[PDB]
Design a protein around this ligand. Structure first.
Ligand SMILES: NC(=[NH2+])c1ccc2[nH]c(-c3ncccc3[O-])nc2c1
Ligand SMILES: [Ca+2]
Length: 223
């Protein structure tokens, strides 16, 4: 997260860290056994880490659970990143409490101007790598579709939305992928891509979760 602030331990209880011997992507807990992240974060050997704040120290509240299966959207295209969503089923359910909690899926899409909270342990520099030990937060608005398409002409599909600041300085970055964009208490976006980090006129692009709620429900129901 570039231009963000320290969230505070366990203030974002649905945030998860996907670990394969090191933190590689973020994710969101939507029920005690399922997590939603990005299809480009897929790999085998994933351990889901819940209740985390400092990813390099065990401080208490952490629950490490292995993934039983990862379901990448069948129409995910790795070249355009269209349908960049993946569901991970956990080997055992998580114990939910005030530090580990699920986030609700939306009933409607959000409109431009809506302010959202993006969080993650991704890079905090737009030029160079500085990865933090604790969770960072950033409040960003969803942008209008014209500003998004004017920023990435021909690269935005209807399953993507831009959120961020065109003046630059604040944005999500590498390491944040798969993580949550929460607006009014609902999961509305998944950190997907962007051109560099916090660059002027290059806002972050996110998976538009409201278009996948029926798919998420049907898939969890049959797995
Ligand atoms: N500007 C953004 N909102 C953004 C978000 C996620 C990213 N992930 C990456 C990224 N991921 C994997 C390898 C290289 C990258 O620059 N860049 C990213 C940029
Ligand atoms: Ca820790």
């Amino acid at each position: 997260i570039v231009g963000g602030y320290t969230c505070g331990a366990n203030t974002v209880p649905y945030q998860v860290s996907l670990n394969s011997g090191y933190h590689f992507c973020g994710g969101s807990l939507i029920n005690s056994q399922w997590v939603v992240s990005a299809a480009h974060c897929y790999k085998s050997g994933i351990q889901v880490r819940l209740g985390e704040d400092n990813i390099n120290v065990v401080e208490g509240n952490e629950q490490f659970i292995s993934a039983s299966k990862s379901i990448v959207h069948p129409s995910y295209n790795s070249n355009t990143l269209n349908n960049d969503i993946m569901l991970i089923k956990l080997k055992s359910a998580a114990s939910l409490n005030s530090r580990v909690a699920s986030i609700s899926l939306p009933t409607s899409c959000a409109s431009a101007g809506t302010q959202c909270l993006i969080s993650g342990w991704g890079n905090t520099k737009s030029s160079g790598t500085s990865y933090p030990d604790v969770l960072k937060c950033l409040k960003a608005p969803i942008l209008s579709d014209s500003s998004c398409k004017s920023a990435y002409p021909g690269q935005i599909t209807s399953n993507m939305f831009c959120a961020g600041y065109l003046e630059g300085g604040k944005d999500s970055c590498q390491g944040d992928s798969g993580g949550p964009v929460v607006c009014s208490g609902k999961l509305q976006g998944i950190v997907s891509w962007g051109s560099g980090c916090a660059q002027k006129n290059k806002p972050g692009v996110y998976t538009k979760v409201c278009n996948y709620v029926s798919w998420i429900k049907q898939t969890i129901a049959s797995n």
